[PDB]
């Protein structure tokens, strides 16, 4: 459900109504328990982007 993905592999969309959103630029299979898997083209809810390298997102 919730986990980290490399910030380099997602693009932050402009802010609008509601939560922040990011676009998955590439497929990424989780490599450690704290990570999540995303498929290229996925629109993920961004939970925390304070870290330069790992962003916390929510995967549906």
Swiss-Prot record:
Residues annotated as domain SH3: 18-60
Localization of this protein: Cytoplasm, Cytoskeleton; Cytoplasm, Cell cortex
Described purpose of this protein according to its UniProt entry: Morphologically, spectrin-like proteins appear to be related to spectrin, showing a flexible rod-like structure. They can bind actin but seem to differ in their calmodulin-binding activity. In nonerythroid tissues, spectrins, in association with some other proteins, may play an important role in membrane organization.
Subunit record text: Like erythrocyte spectrin, the spectrin-like proteins are capable of forming dimers which can further associate to tetramers. Interacts with ACP1.
Entry similarity comment: Belongs to the spectrin family.
Protein name (record): Spectrin alpha chain, non-erythrocytic 1
Organism the protein comes from: Gallus gallus
Gene name of this polypeptide: SPTAN1
Residues of the full protein shown: 968 to 1010 of 2477
